[PDB]
Amino acid sequence: WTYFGPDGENSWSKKYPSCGGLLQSPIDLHSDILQYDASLTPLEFQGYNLSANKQFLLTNNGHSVKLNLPSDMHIQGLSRYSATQLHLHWGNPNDPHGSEHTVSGQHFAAELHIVHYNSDLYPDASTASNKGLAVLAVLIEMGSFNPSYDKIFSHLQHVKYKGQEAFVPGFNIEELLPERTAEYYRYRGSLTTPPCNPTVLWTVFRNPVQISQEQLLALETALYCTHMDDPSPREMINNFRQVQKFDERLVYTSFSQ
Amino acid sequence: WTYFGPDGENSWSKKYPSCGGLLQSPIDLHSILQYDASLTPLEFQGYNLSAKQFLLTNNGHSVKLNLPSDMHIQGLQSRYSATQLHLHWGNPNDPHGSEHTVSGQHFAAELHIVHYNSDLYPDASTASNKSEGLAVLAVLIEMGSFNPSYDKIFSHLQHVKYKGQEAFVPGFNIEELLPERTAEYYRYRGSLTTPPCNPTVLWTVFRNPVQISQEQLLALETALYCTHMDDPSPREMINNFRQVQKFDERLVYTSFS
Numbered sequence: 295w296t297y298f299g300p301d302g303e304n305s306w307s308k309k310y311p312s313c314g315g316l317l318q319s320p321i322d323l324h325s326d327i328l329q330y331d332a333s334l335t336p337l338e339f340q341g342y343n344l345s346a347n348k349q350f351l352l353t354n355n356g357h358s359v360k361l362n363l364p365s366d367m368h369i370q371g372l373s374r375y376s377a378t379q380l381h382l383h384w385g386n387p388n389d390p391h392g393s394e395h396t397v398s399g400q401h402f403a404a405e406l407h408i409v410h411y412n413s414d415l416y417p418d419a420s421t422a423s424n425k426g427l428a429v430l431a432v433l434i435e436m437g438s439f440n441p442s443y444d445k446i447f448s449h450l451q452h453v454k455y456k457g458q459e460a461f462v463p464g465f466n467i468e469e470l471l472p473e474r475t476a477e478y479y480r481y482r483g484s485l486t487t488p489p490c491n492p493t494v495l496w497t498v499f500r501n502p503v504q505i506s507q508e509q510l511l512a513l514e515t516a517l518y519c520t521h522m523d524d525p526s527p528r529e530m531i532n533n534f535r536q537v538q539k540f541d542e543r544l545v546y547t548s549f550s551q
Numbered sequence: 552w553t554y555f556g557p558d559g560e561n562s563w564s565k566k567y568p569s570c571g572g573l574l575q576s577p578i579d580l581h582s583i584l585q586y587d588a589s590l591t592p593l594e595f596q597g598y599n600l601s602a603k604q605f606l607l608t609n610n611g612h613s614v615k616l617n618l619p620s621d622m623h624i625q626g627l628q629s630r631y632s633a634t635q636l637h638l639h640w641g642n643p644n645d646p647h648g649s650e651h652t653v654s655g656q657h658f659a660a661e662l663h664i665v666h667y668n669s670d671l672y673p674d675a676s677t678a679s680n681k682s683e684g685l686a687v688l689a690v691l692i693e694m695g696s697f698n699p700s701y702d703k704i705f706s707h708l709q710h711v712k713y714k715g716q717e718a719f720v721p722g723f724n725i726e727e728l729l730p731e732r733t734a735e736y737y738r739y740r741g742s743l744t745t746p747p748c749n750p751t752v753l754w755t756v757f758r759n760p761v762q763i764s765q766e767q768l769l770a771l772e773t774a775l776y777c778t779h780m781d782d783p784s785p786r787e788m789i790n791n792f793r794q795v796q797k798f799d800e801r802l803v804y805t806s807f808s
């Protein structure tokens with residue numbers, strides 16, 4: 295599966311039935327489908343300050359570049375959910391508008407997902423994935439240089455091709471989160487890639503973060519979906535799914551205005 | 552095929568492979584726009600239909616009005632003769648169901664007047680999978696003042712509430728359904744927005760919307776079902792629009808600057 299051409303997103307459901315099922319993500323966040331919910335209290339981020347003396351595996355699997363996260367990293371306020379990995383979605387150098395969620399019909403430059411699984415109930419994210427998952431999403435805007443995101447981006451020229459891995463020193467993952475994390479959108483949805491399992495509790499923070507034009511350009515030019523020896527290379531660009539019908543869902547907000 | 556559940560748009564490409572192919576519509580029209588002085592005004596000939604009768608149908612996917620082949624666009628390289636018109640809309644809880652979007656925003660609804668290349672082909676079915684086959688005019692609709700001309704269609708909707716039902720509409724001037732300043736339009740090559748999704752449509756989306764009243768819009772959204780009258784599980788005809796498609800390395804040409 296890909297994001298472009300005969301294996302792109304309109305065809306995923308041919309091999310991955312859930313991609314044609316209910317509760318799919320991402321979605322457009324707009325007024326008609328939002329409702330304030332005062333029960334959406336703040337999440338607590340536990341163990342996000344990863345030791346700088348430890349190192350965490352960054353991998354290009356051909357579809358994504360993901361940073362593995364330790365299971366002692368958790369979110370509470372929900373079961374306790376343990377982190378498993380983070381990754382991003384982006385556009386391309388000539389169109390830096392590759393967020394997955396949109397807000398009032400507009401794409402952000404990119405989007406960070408921090409994937410967690412219910413470690414109360416399941417021994418790993420793969421198991422949880424068809425039960426199970428909570429993903430935090432941070433919208434990313436073109437803006438100022440972001441030293442915290444650069445702790446990841448500065449290693450991308452070392453995982454350019456599918457199957458490559460690198461180590462990233464620990465840092466405080468909460469530095470990747472925006473202002474006022476108490477303010478978020480919450481809804482029931484799905485993985486945004488195959489197998490599109492409808493098993494995700496989404497939290498999209500209200501406020502975006504910024505990374506620079508130069509950071510976006512590096513992100514949009516550094517990576518390939520294909521192996522280092524593939525005679526038909528494919529750039530890892532435009533790796534976002536279109537927004538989905540909302541299938542009668544509402545999105546609940548922790549902010550009223 | 553449907554607009555929801557497991558037979559909705561992500562699954563159309565199973566039976567209708569072009570739905571996962573190139574040149575898919577609809578798209579977001581955002582400032583990918585390039586003025587093209589070649590885009591001269593169309594002339595709508597034979598649109599003043601003899602106050603003759605024209606068949607309105609509900610085929611379970613759509614409510615269409617059949618149009619006569621002496622109605623045609625002038626100004627394209629070939630003559631394109633009308634075949635039918637129909638609309639797309641959302642639902643009362645989210646009344647934003649145009650197919651095309653403008654700067655990420657949906658309009659309330661959208662009218663399509665479908666035509667086929669009658670210089671090259673004998674009917675719209677034959678043309679629909681052929682080069683230069685189809686041309687569709689799209690009118691964006693927003694809620695505002697009551698529109699007597701659209702009521703010439705909408706007054707008949709109760710009589711075609713269920714799949715298989717038909718009503719006769721006396722001829723009227725179809726040009727009355729077009730917006731102000733039809734000289735101003737967006738133009739691009741795309742596809743059918745329903746199965747079989749053939750990439751054979753020259754789209755003309757007028758720049759300016761029309762208005763219908765809040766009551767007319769609600770009637771459109773509430774009058775029709777996608778099921779037969781005797782179906783023990785009725786399904787409302789709502790949200791009958793396709794999500795926008797990726798449109799990369801491509802322009803939409805505008806007749807205006």
Ligand SMILES: CCCC(CCC)CCN1CCS(=O)(=O)c2c(F)c(F)c(S(N)(=O)=O)c(F)c21
Nearest residue numbers: 355357358378407409419420423484485486487
């Ligand atoms: C980590 C729990 C879900 C895993 C279970 C097996 C380990 C399958 C899906 N998974 C791994 C394959 S992937 O292609 O690298 C990929 C991806 F690119 C994504 F963007 C998302 S998203 N946006 O979070 O849905 C994924 F969730 C995701």
Ligand SMILES: CCCC(CCC)CCN1CCS(=O)(=O)c2c(F)c(F)c(S(N)(=O)=O)c(F)c21
Nearest residue numbers: 612613634663665675676679743744745746747
């Ligand atoms: C009319 C030339 C194309 C026909 C050829 C066979 C007669 C097949 C498709 N056709 C007929 C089936 S349908 O489901 O009633 C339907 C529809 F609802 C649409 F919204 C559009 S459109 N204009 O793509 O938005 C259609 F074009 C359309």
Ligand SMILES: [Zn+2]
Nearest residue numbers: 381383407486
């Ligand atoms: Zn993701």
Ligand SMILES: [Zn+2]
Nearest residue numbers: 637639663744
């Ligand atoms: Zn249509």
